[PDB]
Design a protein around this ligand. Structure first.
Ligand SMILES: Nc1ncnc2c1ncn2[C@@H]1O[C@H](COP(=O)(O)OP(=O)(O)O)[C@@H](O)[C@H]1O[C@@H]1O[C@H](COP(=O)(O)O)[C@@H](O)[C@H]1O
Lengths: 626, 424, 600
């Protein structure tokens, strides 16, 4: 319960602050801010310790900000989201968007994309990318340029999977040292689905305006203040941009952004996709909210937004003057130097219900919120919503082991049913034709039970109640492979018995279940990360979708028996010949079970029909050219 | 030989038991050889013949089974010894030697005008001795026929004035009802078990009109012909058992008032119905129904909405129906219910919220209901539950109800795996 | 933990060791008969950063693998991963074993029926810990199990070992034999936490200040390098403590894994019993390794009004304050438990910086200690469930399988061949029992991998015997299932590629208990080697090409039959092996080591 649960955000924040990674990142950011006006990016350097220290590369996007300010703000013109699959260049983010269907594509900020393209124009960036290949890279940057760095980091990672075919990809970490929101919820979901959200961090000041100003609707977004904040890092259009600073009420602007953040921080609970009035910008990755007292790391995006709104809304005592955005965005070095010092001090305390409440209070004090203010009252509750309630994932896996052990006898009975009909027609055709119903009903019951169990396992995986390394365990992947290779033909027979292939579509394209695709991906990853001829037919067919191809080939042959158009029948005969060659190659290697070579199996009938069709003069003439 | 050395010993042992038990043994012998005999049909025919409506028939069956005379095959996943559920889950199998002794005892009587006529052979044609003695029709109460593909021309004139039951075992795609089926004026039960691997149809429907005082029927692997507009009131019919019968939506298109065609129907059993989208609503218009049992139907998506019109149902056994997902609310307004069985309902989302109105409920079976993980609050108001069989997952759910109801008992049962499905 | 309390004999021994360590390579021998005859071996400390503390290597922490010959038990039983320790300390101990006559002196005290003890200060105590373990290994391997356990008394010793190193000693039960006295302000035990090889100038500077022989009379005071080193040490200690805190608290964040590769974490972990000298009249005793690691940082937090230079001076001087231990140990000292007191304290109430045993800890320290205590309780709860319903179910399944073996043995057939065919109902029933047994055993193995069970689980004789019976009755059935599904033609050999991890764990448990060579107990996997031989002989290879492997199979079968580990169903005149053997060439059959065991 609450007494047995502990708060862990402040521990992670202290771990992040203690390490000099943030200090080195800010040093690189300051080096870039000091004269990165040249087209080339910030000096990689390496720190001298090539082995001890990973290569640290900073990215300053001041020139991109100047280019944007040349054309003016206009209102959302530079902040209009741009897609990746359709617009811009999808080559860089093909793994990111190679399947996009829901609420727009991943999308990205236009200015960040422009800065990324400008960096990509320089061949020196490509040379540096080639040099840092095969190592660990820390991607840093201040203001929007840091976000640009994130994009670059993403691109690097977006190519690492290409290089990391067998070995795991080298670790690359991006910090972005505080940047406005880059992508919508689609991009966050795409990153999370790739197990790629752990390579990004975000450090946001307590009273900074830039990281949270994107929460307002795009029509009211102050492009000028953000572009001028990026311009401020440049050493002393510029006069006009600075003039926009003076003609801006700090209190009024703070009121507007606070109101927008409050409106956007409670819309998640009342999920209304039908009314997306607010800006689609959403945070991604893990956010390290920093303050002179300390830090707190939040991974839940909803909790991240809630904590951001709570820490900006919570104002210091009125004796302190109105915080200027320049000082708020340009004091990060002082905080970097200060948080470890405060965390190394044993401050003496001067009726908590449980240790969880104490941890929440400590994290809130480290986050910089005002305890006396009422803003801490909802935030604590928000901190209670982020934490999940339940047993540890290790115990879940341990219980799932015995659950699978108990469920396996159903698979054993399915194996007995398959072995029963392996001599005359085959278990696939028997299941499709529903021969011997008193056994077909039992087989269907066992198949349904197995499918329900595996769907429950997948649902548990999707909720993150299981260990992250679940998909990289030999036992689970081989059990899933066995279940797939034994039961999937039954599912194909059930699908083709209801004539769903003529209404829903092809089984391999639309009718296939997500479970089987995930199992195939797991098997492929296991084979990559880790032959004598078969003297006898294998117990199970290696290809789980062979019967679907057989059914498609039979349908194509039946269509060709009546097709009259030469141009169409040419391509259908080409496909039939390709499948015939594939089937012959599979049979010669004896990679198929004996039930496939059964005299009354569908494969033999298809072979006979294909030979009869080939006997035709027109088919022979068409195949002769091919 | 063995007839006098060993078979005569068994005959003398049977001769020790007098009257009802001996005639029950003979009736069991008349049943088809090496065939699984359901308990319900045997009890029904015993009650019809020996007037053993009382549990004395059950006692006689137990006494017969206690002397290694008949094998009582009992399903492993059964927690009830001799309860109502167990009364429909047993089977009776006889030994070959005992059946041969019964055949010899029957043959001790005259060939014609005997008490039981049995032909223990698979000859396609009818017995030649019976045709030779066809001049004098027999008065045998039980007649056994075992022929293959038989047409209308493959019959000859018989009569059985005193017969009350007849067994017809065959294996073909079509069948014509013999003319002599229009001879018994007091026939009470008919058996139409079909061995044919292909679905078998029936002919001579007008013969069913001639049938009267019939109270039992057990069809198996028979395609039911559509019911025409003709009434044909089987008033005395009370029990119908359909096992592995493909209706082929014949009853779907039939719109006849079931209150007159089957006015006294009480027990209906549908087992292993391969193709059945939904039961017709007309079955809800029969108030005499008191026991509905749908078993191993994988296509039954939804029960009829107006299931509460029965107002007489006492035992509801709907199990092994994956397609079923919800129960009709009208089942809440079903008084006198005592045994509800929803076992093996894998895709049962939830129970109706008005379950509290189900008074006098005694036993609930919800084993292997993985999807069912929520119970209505009204279940706490069931002040009549005394025994619940369910898995361990629902035990936590019933932990709240067992405090309110003191006599409620929850039994945890685990799945059992066997290889009997192959035996058949 | 009743063993935490120190008996009167133990206190007298500790007082004697303190006098030798702090008198008013070159090991010293001291003989005393109070309270019982004993021999004390003292080890001088080292005041050199290189090669005394950190050797010459590219490793940033100076860690090296342990010698299998000297320490054959300091390894993971389940996985076989060798333990790691400080390279410099391991090399120093090895020189004494080969060069110094210490090996002769320790044997003489054993011949004198005197309990031996090991004492040392600073790096000297670190070597004493290795010496105590080495003596334990020699006694355990031999039949002289009646020898008295060594007493390892250390006064402010640096952290030496690894997570595998700490687990190994707890599994054997030798943690009670090691006592570590550490001043809460002492800096020496926390030095290995910061990287040693990377920062050698700072370590040498502080070692020179702490060296009694080295003069330290700087008029200015402590050099600025020492003050900078102290600040880095505190920051490094915070990083390792925070990383380990999330392990037993339940963070489970996807960013933690990536951060490991980008930050330097010390692999050294506390080992043995630690007795913090909170005050003169109190002695906090902690046995949990996680609690000790957290205490190493939260006891060094800076005061509200104090400079880092002042704090470093107190830490440096605290290393030379272990002298009053001897005088204090003479009188009774309250051995107040720390984990129990912290857990007993009500949450919220008295949450301020209370005394709590004399050490005014912080609010985060209280939460960290409470989380560590609950982690230990959770592990004990998991063991109770495994020893309850899980243990009962395993025994029932084994009984059912034993009857199946007996039934087949009455028809002069082997249960291996019968299970391979899977013809009758009995084979199906055995398959169901086998599947249930696999699930129960896999849960135990999975929980052991992630350290969800006490370290002593693998040493209990009840589970070792049960695992051996399970392995020697179900492994042939699992082998038959592997080969009856033709799984050897798409994955690989059973003994090479596909073998359940549970059987590997059980075999290693039995081998460790009997102190036999690892990987030699392969009696259960006898059919697997026979099936592969029959597969190769039918794949084109001739008998002359594989006769070398056949005689090895025959020799192993003969040796196993003598001990009785070999199954009794292999020579029943109807097994596959017997029929296959008769088809072998007459020359091999005429002269074979199994020519009489076959039922000719
Ligand atoms: N080609 C394969 N196909 C499918 N399963 C395989 C294959 N090869 C090995 N296994 C099984 O995969 C597990 C390895 O994970 P492991 O325990 O080591 O854990 P990790 O490595 O993740 O830490 C072991 O249990 C192997 O069990 C053997 O294979 C038979 C499977 O039959 P079954 O399904 O009835 O059990 C069993 O009879 C045993 O001979």
């Amino acid at each position: 319960e609450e007494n047995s649960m502990f708060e862990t955000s402040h521990v992670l924040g202290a771990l992040l602050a203690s390490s000099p990674l943030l200090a080195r990142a800010w040093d690189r950011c300051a080096a870039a801010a000091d004269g990165g006006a040249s087209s080339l990016g910030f000096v990689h350097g390496g720190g001298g310790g090539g082995e001890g220290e990973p290569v640290c590369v900073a990215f300053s996007g001041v020139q991109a900000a100047l280019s944007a300010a040349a054309g003016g703000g206009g209102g959302a013109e530079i902040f209009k989201p741009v897609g990746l699959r359709g617009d811009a260049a999808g080559r860089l983010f093909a793994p990111l968007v190679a399947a996009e269907a829901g609420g727009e594509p991943v999308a990205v900020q236009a200015l960040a994309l422009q800065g990324f393209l400008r960096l990509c124009r320089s061949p020196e960036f490509q040379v540096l990318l080639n040099q840092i290949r095969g190592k660990a890279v820390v991607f840093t940057g201040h203001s929007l340029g840091g976000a640009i760095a994130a994009l670059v980091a993403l691109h690097y990672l977006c190519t690492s999977s290409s290089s990391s075919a067998f070995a795991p990809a080298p670790p690359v970490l991006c910090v972005t040292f505080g940047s406005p929101l880059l992508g919508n919820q689609a991009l966050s979901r795409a990153i999370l689905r790739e197990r790629w959200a752990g390579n990004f961090c975000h450090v946001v000041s307590q009273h900074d305006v830039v990281p949270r100003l994107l929460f307002c609707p795009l029509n009211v977004i102050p492009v000028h203040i953000v572009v001028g904040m990026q311009l401020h890092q440049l050493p002393v259009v510029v006069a006009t941009v600075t003039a926009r600073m003076a003609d801006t009420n700090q209190e009024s602007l703070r009121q507007l952004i606070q109101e927008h953040a409050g409106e956007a921080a409670i819309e998640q609970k009342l999920a209304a996709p039908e009314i997306p009035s607010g800006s689609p910008y959403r945070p991604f990755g893990a956010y390290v909210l920093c303050s002179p007292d300390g830090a707190a790391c939040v991974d839940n995006p909803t909790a991240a937004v809630q904590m951001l709104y709570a820490t900006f809304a919570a104002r210091r005592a009125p004796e302190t003057g109105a915080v200027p955005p320049e000082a708020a965005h340009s004091c990060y070095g002082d905080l970097v130097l200060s948080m470890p010092h405060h965390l190394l001090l044993k401050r003496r305390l001067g009726p908590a219900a449980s240790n969880y409440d104490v941890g929440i209070s400590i994290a809130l004090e480290a986050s910089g919120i005002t305890g006396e203010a009422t803003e801490a009252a909802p935030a604590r509750q928000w901190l209670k919503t982020s934490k999940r309630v339940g047993r540890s994932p290790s115990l879940n896996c341990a219980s799932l082991a015995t659950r699978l052990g108990r469920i396996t006898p159903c698979r054993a009975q399915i194996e007995w049913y398959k072995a029963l009909f392996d001599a005359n027609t085959g278990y696939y055709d028997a299941f499709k034709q529903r021969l011997s119903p008193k056994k077909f009903s039992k087989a269907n019951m066992y198949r349904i039970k197995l499918a329900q169990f595996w769907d429950g396992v997948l649902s548990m995986l999707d909720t993150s109640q299981l260990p992250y390394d679940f998909h990289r365990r030999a036992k689970w992947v081989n059990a899933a492979h066995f279940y797939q290779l034994l039961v999937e033909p039954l599912d194909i027979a059930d699908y083709h018995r209801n004539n769903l292939h003529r209404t829903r579509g092809s089984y391999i394209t639309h009718g296939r279940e997500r479970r089987y695709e995930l199992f195939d991906k797991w098997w492929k990853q296991k084979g990559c990360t880790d032959t004598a001829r078969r003297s006898k037919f294998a117990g199970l067919t290696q290809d789980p979708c062979f019967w679907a191809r057989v059914e498609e080939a039979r349908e194509q042959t039946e269509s060709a028996k009546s097709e009259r158009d030469m141009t169409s029948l040419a391509r259908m005969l080409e496909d039939l010949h390709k499948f015939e060659r594939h089937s012959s190659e599979l049979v010669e290697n004896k990679e198929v079970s004996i039930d496939v070579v059964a005299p009354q199996s569908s494969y033999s009938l298809w072979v006979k029909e294909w030979n009869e069709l080939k006997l035709r003069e027109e088919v022979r003439t068409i195949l002769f050219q091919f | 030989s063995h007839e006098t050395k060993l078979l005569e010993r068994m005959a003398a042992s049977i001769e020790c038991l007098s009257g009802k038990v001996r005639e029950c043994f003979l009736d069991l012998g008349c049943f088809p050889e090496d065939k699984k005999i359901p308990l319900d049909v045997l009890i029904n025919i015993w009650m019809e013949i020996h007037d053993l409506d009382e549990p004395d028939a059950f006692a006689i069956l137990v006494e017969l089974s206690n002397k290694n005379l008949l094998t009582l095959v009992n399903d492993a996943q059964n927690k009830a010894g001799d309860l109502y559920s167990s009364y429909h889950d047993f089977s009776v199998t006889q030994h070959d030697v005992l059946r041969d002794l019964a055949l010899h005892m029957s043959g001790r009587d005259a060939l014609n005008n005997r008490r039981r006529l049995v032909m223990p052979r698979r000859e396609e044609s009818l017995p030649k001795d019976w045709q030779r003695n066809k001049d004098t029709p027999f008065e045998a109460q039980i007649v056994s026929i075992h022929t293959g593909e038989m047409k209308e021309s493959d019959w000859f004139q018989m009569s059985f004035p005193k017969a009350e039951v007849l067994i017809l075992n065959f294996a073909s795609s079509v069948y014509y009802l013999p003319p002599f089926i229009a001879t018994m004026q007091n026939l009470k039960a008919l058996v139409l078990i079909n061995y044919g691997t292909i679905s078998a149809t029936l002919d001579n429907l007008s013969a069913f009109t001639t049938l009267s005082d019939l109270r039992s029927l057990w069809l198996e692997k028979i395609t039911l012909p559509p019911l025409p507009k003709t009434t044909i009131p089987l008033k005395n019919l009370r029990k119908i058992s359909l096992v592995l019968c493909e209706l082929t939506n014949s009853l779907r298109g039939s719109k006849v008032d079931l209150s007159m065609t089957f006015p006294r129907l009480s027990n209906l059993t549908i087992d292993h119905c391969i193709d059945l989208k939904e039961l017709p609503s007309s079955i809800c218009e029969i108030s005499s129904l008191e026991s509905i049992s749908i078993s191993n139907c994988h296509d039954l998506t939804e029960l009829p909405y107006e299931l509460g019109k029965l107002h007489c149902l006492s035992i509801l056994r709907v199990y092994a129906c994956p397609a079923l997902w919800r129960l009709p609310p009208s089942v809440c307004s079903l008084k006198r219910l005592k045994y509800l069985d929803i076992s093996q309902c894998v895709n049962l989302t939830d129970l109706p919220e008005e379950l509290g109105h189900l008074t006098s409920l005694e036993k609930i079976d919800m084993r292997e209901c993985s999807r069912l993980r929520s119970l209505p609050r009204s279940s706490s108001s069931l002040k009549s539950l005394g025994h619940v069989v369910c898995d361990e997952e629902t035990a936590l759910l019933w932990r709240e109800a067992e405090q309110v109801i003191p006599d409620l008992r929850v039994q945890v049962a685990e799945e059992c795996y066997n290889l009997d499905w192959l035996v058949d | 933990p009743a063993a935490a309390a120190l008996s009167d004999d133990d206190r007298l021994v500790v007082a004697h060791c303190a006098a030798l360590s702090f008198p008013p390579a070159s090991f010293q021998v001291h003989h005393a008969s109070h309270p019982y005859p004993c021999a004390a071996f003292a080890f001088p400390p080292s005041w050199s950063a290189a090669p005394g503390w950190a050797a010459a290597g590219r490793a940033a922490f100076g860690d090296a693998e342990v010698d299998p010959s000297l320490f054959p038990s300091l390894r993971s039983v389940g996985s076989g991963v060798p333990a790691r320790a400080n390279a410099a300390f391991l090399a120093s101990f090895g020189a004494l074993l080969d060069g110094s006559p210490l090996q002769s002196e320790v044997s003489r005290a054993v011949a004198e029926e005197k309990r031996i003890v090991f004492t040392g200060h600073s790096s000297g105590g670190s070597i004493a810990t290795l010496a105590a373990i080495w003596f334990l290994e020699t006694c355990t391997r031999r039949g002289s199990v009646n020898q008295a356990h060594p007493f390892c008394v250390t006064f402010g010793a640096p952290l030496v070992g690894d997570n595998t190193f700490n687990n190994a000693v707890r599994r054997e039960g030798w943690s009670q034999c090691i006592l570590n006295f550490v001043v809460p302000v002492d800096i020496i035990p926390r030095i290995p936490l910061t990287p040693l090889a990377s920062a050698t100038e700072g370590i040498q500077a502080v070692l020179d200040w702490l060296s009694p022989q080295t003069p330290n009379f700087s008029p200015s005071g402590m050099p600025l390098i020492i003050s900078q080193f102290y600040e880095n040490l505190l920051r490094s200690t915070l990083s390792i403590a925070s990383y380990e805190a999330c392990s037993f608290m339940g963070c489970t964040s996807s960013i933690l894994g990536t951060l490991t590769s980008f930050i330097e974490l010390s692999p050294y972990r506390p080992c043995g019993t630690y007795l913090f000298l909170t005050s003169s009249e109190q002695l906090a005793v902690l046995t949990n390794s996680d609690a000790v690691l957290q205490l190493l940082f939260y006891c060094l937090q800076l005061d509200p009004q104090q400079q880092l230079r002042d704090a470093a001076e107190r830490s440096l001087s605290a290393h030379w304050q272990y002298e009053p231990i001897k005088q204090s140990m003479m009188q009774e000292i309250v051995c107040v438990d720390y984990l129990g007191v912290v857990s007993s304290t009500l949450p919220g109430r008295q949450m301020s910086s209370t005394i709590v045993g004399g050490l005014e800890l912080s609010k985060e320290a209280m939460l960290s200690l409470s989380a560590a205590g609950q982690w230990e309780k959770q592990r004990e709860t998991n063991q109770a469930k495994i020893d309850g319903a899980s243990c009962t179910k395993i025994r029932e399944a084994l009984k059912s399988l034993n009857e199946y073996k007996r039934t087949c043995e009455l028809h002069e057939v082997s249960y291996y061949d019968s299970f391979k065919l899977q013809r009758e109902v009995h084979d199906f029933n055995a398959n169901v029992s086998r599947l249930e047994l696999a699930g129960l055993w896999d849960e135990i193995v999975e929980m052991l991998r992630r350290r969800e069970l006490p370290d002593g689980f693998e040493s209990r004789q009840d589970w070792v015997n049960l695992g051996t019976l399970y392995r020697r009755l179900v492994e042939p059935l699992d082998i038959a299932n592997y080969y009856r599904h033709s799984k050897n033609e798409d994955t690989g050999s059973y003994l090479s590629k596909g073998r359940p991890r549970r059987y590997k764990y059980t075999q290693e448990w039995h081998e460790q208990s009997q102190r036999i060579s690892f990987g030699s107990s392969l009696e259960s996997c006898f059919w697997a080697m026979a099936e592969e031989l029959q597969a190769e002989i039918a794949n084109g290879k001739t008998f002359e090409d594989v006769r070398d492997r056949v005689v090895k199979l025959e020799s192993d079968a003969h040796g196993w039959s003598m001990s009785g580990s070999l199954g009794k169903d292999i020579f029943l005149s109807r097994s596959s092996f017997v029929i296959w053997w008769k088809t072998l060439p007459e020359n091999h059959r005429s002269a074979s080591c199994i020519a009489k065991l076959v039922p000719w």
